[PDB]
Amino acid sequence: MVSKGEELFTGVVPILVELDGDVNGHKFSVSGEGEGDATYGKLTLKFICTTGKLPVPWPTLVTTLVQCFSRYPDHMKQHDFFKSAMPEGYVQERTIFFKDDGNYKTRAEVKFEGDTLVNRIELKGIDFKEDGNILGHKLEYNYISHNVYITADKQKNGIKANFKIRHNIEDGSVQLADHYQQNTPIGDGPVLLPDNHYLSTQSALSKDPNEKRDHMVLLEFVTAAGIT
């Protein structure tokens, strides 16, 4: 491409996601494909477990499996770190702490390869309970949380974020998952370092009735907010 930063996102952009994971002695891989339309904050993706049965619940991987597709209101476009890092991209790292259970540690590189926005991820699970909500596959196949709270990390020329996800459990209880996130640019060039704000996400998890592989279909709408 000729284009840089926000100019890369003005139409519909193809997305490719590749994840390698290891949790509870089970190595697995996930591939995803779809498209993103940042003008409307809209993402449509289908994910497939390419190694057989996914050893963790699909809802626990949603946040790991491209915040560059967020709709930033015109008055907030100076605060969009994620697009400003493109096409060279950014590293996104998280620790996701499942309350009274284990943790995910994730590292991803998000960048353009030609026309396609690619998210390549490694995930490691730490100290999960075999009888717990995650390894028991006790989570409902839905989603209920929305906000990601962003702050600048100027010393690293990037951002941090923190937010709690609530996963509904089949018995009516909830499993909390506290996300700590850091993003840093891959390249040497400038980025937009934002004032405090948040991303609000609306979602929908579904299934493809013709797909025999373990999979997840995702529709998401994401909008930046919290400044005037």
Residue numbers in the entry: 0 to 64, 68 to 230
Could you pull the original sentences from the published paper?
The examples shown in the Methods section ascertain that SeU can be successfully and conveniently used as a practical and easily applicable vehicle for phasing novel crystal structures of macromolecules by the SAD (or MAD) approach through the anomalous signal of selenium. The use of SeU as a provider of anomalous signal for the SAD phasing has been examined on crystals of several proteins and a nucleic acid.
The two amide groups of SeU may serve as donors in hydrogen bonds formed with various acceptors, such as carbonyl or carboxyl functions of various amino acids, hydroxyl groups of Thr and Tyr residues or suitable atoms of nucleic acids. On the other hand, the Se atom in the central selenocarbonyl moiety of SeU may accept hydrogen bonds from various donors, provided by amides, hydroxyl groups and protonated amines. The high concentrations of urea are routinely used for denaturation of proteins, but no adverse effects were observed after relatively short exposure of protein crystals to SeU.
